[PDB]
Design a protein around this ligand. Sequence first.
Ligand SMILES: CCC(=O)Nc1cc(Nc2cc(NC3CC3)n3ncc(C#N)c3n2)ccc1C
Length: 327
Amino acid sequence: GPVPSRARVYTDVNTHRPREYWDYESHVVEWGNQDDYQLVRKLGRGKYSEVFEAINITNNEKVVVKILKPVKKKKIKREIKILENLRGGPNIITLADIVKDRTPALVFEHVNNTDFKQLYQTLTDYDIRFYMYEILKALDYCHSMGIMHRDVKPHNVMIDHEHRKLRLIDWGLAEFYHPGQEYNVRVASRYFKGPELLVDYQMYDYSLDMWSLGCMLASMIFRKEPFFHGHDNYDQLVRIAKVLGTEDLYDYIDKYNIELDPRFNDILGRHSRKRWERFVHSENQHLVSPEALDFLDKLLRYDHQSRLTAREAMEHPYFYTVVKDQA
Ligand SMILES: CCC(=O)Nc1cc(Nc2cc(NC3CC3)n3ncc(C#N)c3n2)ccc1C
């Protein structure tokens, strides 16, 4: 069977906490008063919810309400517990309230978001570095708190551009990291799935989030959304292999003694590792630096153990200007 793996960092953070921190099955939800909110307008939909703008009539605050579709009580408890554990951390969305009426509804802080597919197009080199740094602060925090997001992607990053304000949202797929735990690989949107998910390696960790982040960075600096455009989960690994190369993929599989689905054998083929130069063009060149490419290269690795940590990523030369400016 497959070789075990442990997170390089924050390995035992949960083991050292009282049981109640991570044992979300035991959590008892604190319900607020539904009558404090009036729905204003529909914002959109999710896999597990319908999302509204509302107003708290107690204090006239704008709020966002996520009314949950039918989900197991333990999955709702997990998201609540994680949001409560992370509350106050840098750039983490605030869960304001939990209400029922017998559908349960999560009430969040409102972020005045600029349209994903209209904001990114205006971003400068500096803007990308700045917002990437802000996401890294949220990820280092949640990882340090023993939590994997497992769904990092543009839709889950709210940006109020006028206020240079960012929040990482939608903790519905997030989970506590426990050394030895075999996690569900059916997580994350296709284009952002890490190689560990695609090859069915269950003993993954915080490093999953760093792959997803690298996918985001590539899409932003290269003006290519998505970067890895697979047709399905199988073809998704092929798209990755056409860039990172098949030699390193098969090295990863060997190292962990992973049993590769036989479907893959006739589709992965043989690919060279490509230089990042082939994605640079006259339109995107203003976003691309040696620093950007070095950083990206160090996130997008097959081997989860070799990817930068959040805290290592924050020390990369790509961010030196940002770090100086924040003083
Ligand atoms: C809260 C529901 C969730 O977890 N995901 C989600 C959010 C959403 N839209 C949104 C949209 C906004 N602001 C936009 C209207 C100006 N905000 N602001 C804060 C939050 C939050 N949290 C937010 N979610 C649309 C679809 C889904 C699935």
